[PDB]
Design a protein around this ligand. Structure first.
Ligand SMILES: CCCCCCCCCCCCCCCCCC(=O)OC[C@H](CO[C@@H]1O[C@H](CO[C@H]2O[C@H](CO)[C@H](O)[C@H](O)[C@H]2O)[C@H](O)[C@H](O)[C@H]1O)OC(=O)CCCCCCCCCCCCCCCCC
Ligand code: CLA
Ligand code: CLA
Ligand code: CLA
Ligand code: CLA
Ligand code: CLA
Ligand SMILES: CCCCCCCCCCCCCCCCCC(=O)OC[C@H](CO[C@@H]1O[C@H](CO)[C@H](O)[C@H](O)[C@H]1O)OC(=O)CCCCCCCCCCCCCCCCC
Ligand SMILES: CC1=C(/C=C/C(C)=C/C=C/C(C)=C/C=C/C=C(C)/C=C/C=C(C)/C=C/C2=C(C)CCCC2(C)C)C(C)(C)CCC1
Ligand SMILES: CC1=C(/C=C/C(C)=C/C=C/C(C)=C/C=C/C=C(C)/C=C/C=C(C)/C=C/C2=C(C)CCCC2(C)C)C(C)(C)CCC1
Ligand SMILES: CC1=C(/C=C/C(C)=C/C=C/C(C)=C/C=C/C=C(C)/C=C/C=C(C)/C=C/C2=C(C)CCCC2(C)C)C(C)(C)CCC1
Ligand SMILES: CCCCCCCCCCCCO[C@@H]1O[C@H](CO)[C@@H](O[C@H]2O[C@H](CO)[C@@H](O)[C@H](O)[C@H]2O)[C@H](O)[C@H]1O
Ligand SMILES: CCCCCCCCCCCCO[C@@H]1O[C@H](CO)[C@@H](O[C@H]2O[C@H](CO)[C@@H](O)[C@H](O)[C@H]2O)[C@H](O)[C@H]1O
Ligand SMILES: [Ca+2]
Ligand SMILES: [Cl-]
Ligand SMILES: [Cl-]
Ligand SMILES: [Fe+2]
Lengths: 32, 35, 341, 37, 334, 450, 78, 39, 60
């Protein structure tokens, strides 16, 4: 079913969002 | 500096890790078996 | 330089994982045991020995998988892969529960190898071998429970199964069939284990709360150096604290740590003695005086007699599914039960 | 069930409540990014 | 200089052989009360109708019990959670028949142990110590409160409290497994890891220290005479102990810091006992352990049993036999 | 501010202690966290709305937030039937969006705002040792808490009412018109025993008493707010308490632990503020329901339910409480203090009335008793309903069980936190939280005990 | 302080380790996957598939009772 | 990434932990589906 | 009704943009003069999108 595909995609986007913020702040040397 | 690659520690790490990942893939395949 | 001393040099080299002479016993056997467990709980059924699913392949989870004990028809047959039952057939060997004596015997030899490793490293480092002497407690429990208990019984079937809920079954089995709570040898084990947990908790808390201020941080963990000669905590303040709180206290650190060894090891050894008793059905099942009084006087009730009734019910309701080889047919009318349940 | 014009976002809502748990995880990640100093 | 300030100085005095303190002013009376009533009831109390079905259970030594079978039997199921002090009984014999001594002993004991925890803080404060020994003692306190107070509150009767006796304790455990499957409850599993691991770590720590003691004696006398009480120096070689244990497993599995190691020793069984106390306290509200009965079915739908199903058969046996005259209705709902 | 051990003395695993004297970053921590609470409120509500089957009872469906909203009188009708799904959705959306606002504000103050607020403003900047400012903040927050309690009062009296399970005609949303302002009843609830038959404040059994208590709480909190704005701590309070940020934290921890225990018992026993139409039956309710169900069933077969002795000699269906009240028999004798709207019509002055049990039992009482005895708060951790010896076919754990277990555990761990922070506050104010000084070790100057 | 081997943090942060283990760990994972999903594990260990716990001629548990001839017993059990 | 010829260790730990929680979530999903789910 | 779904999808996409952007902009002291009006405009656009979602909900 396509419901669980979207659930996993929304979950994967939310999961990557936090480490993305950390990764852009570490890659550009922000106020970590 | 110039550490050996293959050691007793290497064999120790792989003796467990290699069938660990094999078994974990097996149990992951098991999760989709239907009745 | 002879070959023995050269081999002794190689085996005793300082490396991430110490091998030693004992590793030749320890590392294959333990790898045979643990892998043999991990194989069985992943793949191997108990359908022909127990009428049970016990693997992840059949749908069981981590709590319900086991390397279950062999079929009762084999008795105490060691069930070698080449033995007269499996006859070299790997699949038949798995199906008849040969993985149970595989894991139990490789585990026994692995535990022997680990104790030998404790002795070997204690000798090479230069310390006294009290870690090995402490590890005799777990060896006594393993040998009494997994080897001597089924050897006193009919077969390897009644040994504990290498699983979480299988161990729970063995536990409840020894309750309802042996009244193993009533056994003073077990009660001494409980005293030793709970006392060792108490000693662990109380000693760790006492040390962490009588620490000397040897640093400036609120993080007190970095005020310790392993090469320092002085005690990191006040024995005097700890002794005064427990003398005024509890009445008595340790005044001797060496006796404190020997007691911390002594309590759970003695508990394990005493419970092992009780398990050796249960191997021959030499139980502390009954108080015959209370049984004769209750048999002649139906107003007399204690908690002991209530527990006897509990064991009776568990035996009758559990035996047909737990011992399927016996073909216990107990009709519904013979099962003991109270009113309305 | 959600009201009908919101029902296209039923899967996203289904993953909404566990976002605070990730926050507890996220701090550890940030400490891992700075070296647990 | 005032009489009250002199009494405050005596109560809080570090020179007392047994520290009293303000928590001790509550602990001493309560614990003495519960101890006196417990000893008298354990020796001589008449049988108690615990289940409220006029079937009195004999708990005391003089009524045919031994040390193993003896108990201070919980109060009547007819009482439930009702407060039953001595003065609400029409006679002492009625109070004894209905299990009043259980309520007296339990309530005073529980106050006494909470004040024991506070007194542990109090003496640590008066001695200039760090204050967290009482936090470690909060784990046996939480377990005692779970079995004597919280589980009766959740089940709606002190009759469901753990009896004050050895075989009564076993009865409590067995009926608890029948009704809650505590063995399959992950918090008891943490308790067991707490006590098994606490005994393991007690033995390892004691064995490692005794293994690495500095030579200060002869082999005639006991090695414990190599330690002087109040000595400044350390009595064992932590580096030898670490060099042993980091070769027994590997180097970074071994504590080189004594403070870190002692913290771990304190923390592991305390956390485990906290978890199992919360397991009993949550099974009070009948949030029970894992139910995997008929979890596995064949392709047709026939049940394939597991070890959980055999465990469930054992749980049935206990359940259909316990308090065998108490139930009038098909479900044991509390 | 130091963000490492060398500059603070606190490790990473104790990092938030680096904020104790950084009031701006502390405020941002506090405000981002509030974001999180309002986020869970909104997102969990939207999840519960999305999974809700409204013709099915809420308690069958794993909901703990929609019962709270339904008890306030939103989206429900008689017998707690769901009229409209939109108020629950509205409550969710508003919390979720606001939580976005609160999260943005916490990040600001935490990452960009001034690390200390004392050099910026005297009204907002605080020193933990400044007893006037601490009581000012208590006072502002007390006026707000009293306003919240008065908002509950306003919802019950002026803006649509609350769900009354005790309402005649059946339980319904009704507007409270005559709240109990009588302080004897309101504070005699505080004076009642925390035991069986009395129940302290858990035994509040009518919405008039609840709403009147919140009028008094609102008045008490508003008056105590002004008190603490206008006043300073007195000498006995100054000499009795520890005055530090960790100390005030530990005082709040003990308070939170107490309210967690009270909440777990409240949801376990009380069916008025936690109506059984939304939360399911209490355990006492379900046990009395089973006894009533089999009383009705055997009475229909012609059993004389009053003259029937059981196996022990007590009455099988009806017996006497220890004070003499006519109550249900078997083990539910323990639960004879239970009161419920389905049961109280069959009760007389002496207890359960024989005439009402013979010729006044309605079919809806039978239906409710069967439903409540089969929805008893007994269940496994993997949500298998009923007794633990039952097989896997009933997916149910009561919301009362989930809420009670959660809050008991939370309450216990917050008592542990109270002991930890109180003890540490005492040691840090006394100066030995970092260990015993070797030169001035106090035991070395004390005399020996014996 | 170090026994002489390469430290683990230097290894698992190296490009060569990840070039190799980006293939070797997924290949082991999908090898275990194919061990299950091809049904080979059932025939290897003798574990019944969900349709062979009971047959048309046996509705009871196939509990072994012979001391030695268990190959014939299991074949008969099917 | 940032380090020359060196992936940061926290990135390795993040990826390994995400994979570990992913396989644990798969096992907890399989508790409710297929074999062993009681339906 | 499709324009309401477009508005809500735009709201969640811009919400994801703001989740990525707001802590990065707040933890960048060297890009603050560029990013502060971007944060102001993002807050305004997000609020306007929320109000538009409410109005189109009552329009559908
Ligand atoms: C500092 C503080 C020191 C204070 C010490 C004083 C003692 C406190 C503990 C009380 C002891 C409780 C024993 C019996 C409890 C009980 O009968 O029940 C609990 C009572 C509730 O009483 C019940 O209240 C009920 C009220 O419901 C009635 O009214 C309702 C109205 O809707 C319904 O209609 C319902 O059907 C009807 O029966 C009934 O009256 C019951 O019969 C009655 O038992 O809770 C209450 O009063 C209040 C909550 C009790 C304590 C909360 C838990 C505390 C646990 C701490 C553990 C800490 C561990 C840490 C370790 C380290
Ligand atoms: C409720 C959870 C919570 C909150 C609100 C805080 C808050 C705070 N912590 Mg603590 N912390 C927590 C949990 C929490 N912590 C936990 C669990 C740990 C243990 C791992 C720590 C360990 C810790 C340490 C060791 C330190 C702090 C410090 C701080 C402060 C400065 C943070 C900083 O410099 O980050 C900088 C980090 C970043 C710039 C990375 C990005 C972070 C942002 C917030 C990501 C937000 C993502 C979100 C989805 C975006 C939404 C945007 C918008 C849509 C709303 C800050 C007030 C520091 C301190 O004391 O300051 C003096 C400090 O040294 N914390
Ligand atoms: C007061 C807290 C609370 C309560 C009572 C509930 C109760 C419930 N939730 Mg909710 N939930 C909560 C918080 C809460 N939740 C939070 C914080 C989140 C976000 C992560 C969610 C997300 C959520 C979802 C997404 C779902 C639920 C669902 C449910 C239901 C089934 C729960 C279940 O099967 O659990 C299983 C039990 C466990 C997982 C046990 C967890 C044990 C914890 C970790 C122990 C912690 C102990 C202690 C605090 C640790 C301290 C350690 C240290 C001090 C030493 C139930 C009504 C489900 C439902 O039916 O909804 C319709 C559902 O789908 N909840
Ligand atoms: C408890 C919450 C709290 C507290 C105490 C503060 C306190 C402060 N903030 Mg912060 N802030 C908060 C939340 C909070 N803020 C939130 C949630 C946001 C995001 C919207 C911000 C965003 C923010 C910014 C961007 C700035 C501040 C600034 C300031 C300082 C000056 C305040 C000022 O000018 O007031 C005087 C202003 C007023 C009296 C008018 C506002 C009145 C409020 C907003 C209306 C009603 C409140 C609310 C809507 C009622 C319902 C709330 C609900 C939760 C119950 C002060 C230290 C400034 C600063 O750092 O100074 C250096 C600054 O630049 N704040
Ligand atoms: C949560 C909000 C809050 C907080 C944090 C405080 C905090 C404080 N108050 Mg305030 N107060 C509040 C709300 C609050 N109050 C309200 C709402 C009112 C209006 C009724 C008042 C009225 C008030 C007055 C009139 C006074 C204070 C005072 C004080 C200070 C000392 C209190 C103290 O030592 O208590 C400790 C309590 C005692 C020493 C009393 C011992 C009695 C025993 C221990 C009670 C045990 C009960 C038991 C634990 C629980 C049973 C529950 C229930 C059945 C009773 C302290 C700053 C005092 C002060 O300094 O004034 C400026 C003071 O004189 N308060
Ligand atoms: C609102 C309540 C509150 C507040 C504001 C604080 C605030 C603080 N605490 Mg306290 N604490 C509390 C409650 C609170 N605590 C409770 C209830 C307990 C008892 C358990 C403690 C026990 C405690 C100890 C033992 C210590 C503190 C310390 C501290 C300081 C540093 C905390 C830090 O950086 O954590 C960093 C955060 C972490 C390392 C992460 C915590 C991980 C927990 C176990 C997760 C629990 C699981 C959770 C339920 C979700 C499950 C997720 C699962 C699915 C994976 C800070 C002042 C420290 C201190 O004394 O500083 C002076 C300290 O050593 N706290
Ligand atoms: C920060 C690290 C985070 C990493 C992110 C990893 C996420 C991976 C998690 C789960 C992986 C699979 C997701 C679930 C598949 C969806 C299938 C479905 O819809 O329902 C499948 C089943 C029932 O399926 C039903 O089917 C119906 C018709 O098809 C409908 O679709 C219903 O909606 C559906 O519920 O429901 C479930 O099994 C949900 C319960 C399990 C969900 C996840 C379990 C726990 C996951 C993670 C927690 C692990 C914790 C370990 C470590 C903790 C400490 C950090
Ligand atoms: C039997 C036998 C044998 C043996 C074998 C072997 C020895 C092997 C093996 C094996 C192995 C060796 C396997 C493995 C495995 C594994 C696994 C199965 C794993 C796992 C895991 C997991 C799942 C984990 C998880 C987790 C947790 C839970 C915690 C935290 C996180 C983590 C993720 C880590 C032979 C052939 C000789 C002969 C015949 C018989
Ligand atoms: C500081 C800090 C921290 C913290 C942080 C925090 C705590 C935060 C937060 C935050 C928050 C608190 C947030 C938020 C958010 C929200 C949002 C973003 C939202 C929204 C919305 C939306 C978009 C919605 C939508 C919808 C609707 C409208 C309806 C329908 C459905 C849906 C869902 C679609 C940490 C720990 C990291 C550490 C570091 C520092
Ligand atoms: C709303 C409501 C109501 C009402 C209620 C009320 C009216 C209340 C209250 C309340 C209150 C009125 C309270 C309270 C409290 C108190 C406390 C909780 C306390 C305490 C204490 C303390 C904390 C102290 C401490 C101390 C001591 C012991 C001495 C030394 C010093 C110190 C400070 C340490 C009712 C039920 C009708 C109904 C339902 C709803
Ligand atoms: C990592 C997991 C490790 C666990 C083991 C995994 C291995 C996979 C199992 C393969 C099983 C093969 O299946 C079975 O193999 C055995 C070999 O012992 C064969 O056995 C045959 O040869 C042996 C060798 O002389 C004879 O003694 C035996 O009587 C005969 O039947 C069987 O004909 C075959 O049915
Ligand atoms: C409850 C009401 C409490 C009132 C008791 C004291 C009120 C004012 C008396 O004086 C207050 O307290 C002590 C005396 O005890 C003084 O010292 C303080 O400087 C003063 O603030
Ligand atoms: Ca969905
Ligand atoms: Cl019994
Ligand atoms: Cl009954
Ligand atoms: Fe020690």
């Amino acid at each position: 079913n396509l419901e669980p595909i979207f659930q996993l995609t929304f979950l994967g986007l939310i999961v990557l969002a936090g480490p993305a913020v950390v990764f852009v702040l570490a890659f550009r040397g922000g106020d970590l | 500096v110039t550490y050996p690659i293959f050691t007793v520690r290497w064999l120790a790490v792989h003796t467990l890790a290699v069938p660990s990942v094999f078994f974990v893939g097996a149990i992951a395949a098991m999760q989709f078996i239907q009745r | 330089r002879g070959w023995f001393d050269v081999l002794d040099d190689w085996l005793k080299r300082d490396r991430f994982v110490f091998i030693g002479w004992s590793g030749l016993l320890l590392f294959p056997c333990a790898f045979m045991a643990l892998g043999g467990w991990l194989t069985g709980t992943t793949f191997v059924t108990s359908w022909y020995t127990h009428g049970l699913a016990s693997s992840y392949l059949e749908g069981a989870n981590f709590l319900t998988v086991a390397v279950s004990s062999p079929a009762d028809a084999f008795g105490h047959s060691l069930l070698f892969l080449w033995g007269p039952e499996a006859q070299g057939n790997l699949t038949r060997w798995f199906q008849i529960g040969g993985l149970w004596p595989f894991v139990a015997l490789h585990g026994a030899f692995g535990l022997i190898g680990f104790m030998l490793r404790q002795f070997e490293i204690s000798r090479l480092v230069g310390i006294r071998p009290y870690n090995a002497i402490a590890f005799s407690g777990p060896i006594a429990v393993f040998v009494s429970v997994f080897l001597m208990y089924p050897l006193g019984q009919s077969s390897w079937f009644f040994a504990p199964s290498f699983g979480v809920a299988g161990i729970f079954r063995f536990i409840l089995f020894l309750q309802g069939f042996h009244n193993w709570t009533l056994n003073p040898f077990h009660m001494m084990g409980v005293a030793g284990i709970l006392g060792g947990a108490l000693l662990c908790a109380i000693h760790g808390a006492t040390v962490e709360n009588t620490l000397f201020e040897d640093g400036e941080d609120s993080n007190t963990f970095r005020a310790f150096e392993p090469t320092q000669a002085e005690e990191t905590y006040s024995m005097v303040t700890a002794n005064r604290f427990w003398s005024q709180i509890f009445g008595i206290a340790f005044s001797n650190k060496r006796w404190l740590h020997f007691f911390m060894l002594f309590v759970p090891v003695t508990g394990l050894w005493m419970s092992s003695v009780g398990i050796v008793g249960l191997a021959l059905n030499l139980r502390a099942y009954d108080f015959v005086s209370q049984e004769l009084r209750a048999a002649e006087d139906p107003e007399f009730e204690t908690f002991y007699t209530a527990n006897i009734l509990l064991n009776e019910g568990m035996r009758a309701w559990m035996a047909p599914q737990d011992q399927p080889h016996e073909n216990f047919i107990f009709p519904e009318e013979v099962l003991p039960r109270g009113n309305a349940l | 069930k959600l009201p009908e014009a919101y029902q296209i976002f039923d899967p996203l809502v289904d993953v909404l409540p566990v976002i605070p748990l990730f926050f507890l995880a996220l701090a550890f990640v940030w400490q891992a990014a700075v070296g647990f100093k | 200089a005032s009489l009250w300030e002199q009494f405050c100085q005596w109560v809080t005095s570090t020179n007392n052989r047994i520290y009293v303190g303000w928590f001790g002013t509550l602990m001493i009376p309560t614990l003495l009360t519960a101890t006196t009533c417990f000893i008298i009831a354990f020796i001589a109390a008449p049988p108690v109708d615990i289940d409220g079905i006029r079937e009195p259970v004999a708990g005391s030594l003089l009524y045919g019990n031994n040390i193993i079978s003896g108990a201070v039997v919980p109060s009547s199921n007819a009482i439930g959670l009702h407060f039953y002090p001595i003065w609400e009984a029409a006679s002492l014999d009625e109070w004894l028949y209905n299990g009043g001594p259980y309520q007296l002993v339990v309530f005073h004991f529980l106050i006494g142990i909470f004040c024991y925890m506070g007194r542990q803080w109090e003496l640590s404060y008066r001695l200039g110590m760090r204050p967290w020994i009482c936090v470690a003692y909060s784990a046996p306190v939480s377990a005692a409160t779970a079995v004597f107070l919280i589980y009766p509150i959740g089940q709606g009767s002190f009759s469901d409290g753990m009896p004050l006796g050895i075989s009564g304790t076993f009865n409590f455990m067995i009926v608890f497994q029948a009704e809650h499957n505590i063995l399959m409850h992950p918090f008891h599993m943490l308790g067991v890891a707490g006590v098994f691991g606490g005994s393991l770590f007690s033995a390892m720590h004691g064995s490692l220290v005794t293994s690495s003691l500095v030579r200060e004696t002869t082999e005639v006398e006991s090695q414990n005479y190599g330690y002087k009480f109040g000595q400044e120096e350390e009595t064992y070689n932590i580096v030898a102990a670490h060099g042993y244990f980091g070769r027994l497993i590997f180097q970074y599995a071994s504590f080189n810091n004594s403070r870190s190691l002692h913290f771990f020793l304190g923390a592991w069984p305390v956390i485990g006992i906290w978890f199992t106390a919360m397991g009993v306290s949550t099974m009070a509200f009948n949030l029970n352990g894992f139910n995997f009965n008929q979890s596995i079915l064949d392709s047709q739908g026939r049940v394939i049993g597991t070890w959980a199903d055999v465990l469930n058969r054992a749980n049935i046996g206990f359940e259909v036999m316990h308090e065998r005259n108490a139930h009038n209705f098909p479900l044991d709902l509390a | 501010g130091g963000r490492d051990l060398p500059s603070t003395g606190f490790a990473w695993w104790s990092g938030n202690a680096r904020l104790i004297n950084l009031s701006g970053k502390l405020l941002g921590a506090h405000v981002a966290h509030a974001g999180l609470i309002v986020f869970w409120a909104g997102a969990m509500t939207l999840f519960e709305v999305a999974h809700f089957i409204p013709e099915k009872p809420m308690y069958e469906q794993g909901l703990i937030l929609l019962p709270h909203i339904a008890t306030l009188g939103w989206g429900v009708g008689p017998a707690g039937e769901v009229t409209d799904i939109f108020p629950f959705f509205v409550v969710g959306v508003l919390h979720l969006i606001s939580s976005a606002v609160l999260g943005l504000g916490g990040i600001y103050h935490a990452l960009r705002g001034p690390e200390v607020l004392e050099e910026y403003s005297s009204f907002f900047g605080y020193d933990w040792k400044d007893k006037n400012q601490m009581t000012n903040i208590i006072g502002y927050h007390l006026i707000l808490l009293g306003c919240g309690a008065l908002l509950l009062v306003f919802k019950a009296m002026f803006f649509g009412g609350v769900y009354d399970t005790w309402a005649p005609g059946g339980g319904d949303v009704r507007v409270i018109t005559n709240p109990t302002l009588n302080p004897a009843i309101i504070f005699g609830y505080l004076l009642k025993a925390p035991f069986g038959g009395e129940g302290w404040i858990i035994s509040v059994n009518n919405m008039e008493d609840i709403i009147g208590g919140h009028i008094w709480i609102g008045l008490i909190c508003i008056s105590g707010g002004i008190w603490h704005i206008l006043t300073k701590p007195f000498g006995w309070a100054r000499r009795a308490l520890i005055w530090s940020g960790e100390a005030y934290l530990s005082y709040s921890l003990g308070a939170l632990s107490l309210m967690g225990f009270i909440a777990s018992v409240f949801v376990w026993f009380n069916n008025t503020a936690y109506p059984s139409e939304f939360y399911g039956p209490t355990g006492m309710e379900a046990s009395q329901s089973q006894a009533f169900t089999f009383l009705v069933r055997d009475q229909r077969l012609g059993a004389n339910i009053a003259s029937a002795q059981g196996p022990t000699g007590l009455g099988k269906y009806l017996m006497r409480s220890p004070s003499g009240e006519i109550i249900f028999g078997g083990e539910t004798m323990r639960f004879w203090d239970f009161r419920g709207p389905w049961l109280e019509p069959l009760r007389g002055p002496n207890g359960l009335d024989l005439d009402k049990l013979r010729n006044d039992i309605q079919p809806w009482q039978v239906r409710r008793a069967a439903e409540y005895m089969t929805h008893a708060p007994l269940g496994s951790l993997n949500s298998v309903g009923g007794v633990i010896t039952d097989v896997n076919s009933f997916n149910y754990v009561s919301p009362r069980a989930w809420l009670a277990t959660s809050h008991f555990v939370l309450g216990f761990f917050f008592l542990v936190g109270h002991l930890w922070h109180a003890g540490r506050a005492r040691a840090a104010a006394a100066g030995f939280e970092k260990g015993i000084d070797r030169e001035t070790e106090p035991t070395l100057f004390m005399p020996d005990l014996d | 302080g170090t026994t002489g081997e390469r430290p683990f943090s230097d290894i698992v942060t190296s490009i060569r380790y990840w070039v190799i283990h980006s293939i070797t760990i997924p290949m082991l994972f999908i090898a275990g996957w194919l061990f299950v999903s091809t049904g080979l594990a059932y025939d290897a260990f003798g574990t019944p598939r969900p349709d062979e716990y009971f047959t048309q001629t046996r509705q009871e548990l196939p509990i072994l009772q012979e001391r030695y001839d268990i190959n014939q017993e299991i074949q008969e059990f099917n | 990434m940032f380090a020359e010829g060196r992936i940061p260790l926290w990135v390795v730990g993040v990826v390994a932990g995400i994979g570990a929680i992913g396989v644990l979530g798969l096992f907890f999903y399989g508790a409710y589906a297929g074999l062993g789910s009681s339906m | 009704s499709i324009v309401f779904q477009i508005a809500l999808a735009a709201l969640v996409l811009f919400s994801f943009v703001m989740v990525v952007g707001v802590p990065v902009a707040y933890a960048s002291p060297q890009n603050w003069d560029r990013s502060k009006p971007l944060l102001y405009l993002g807050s305004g656009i997000w609020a306007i999108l929320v109000i538009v979602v409410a109005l189109l909900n009552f329009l559908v």
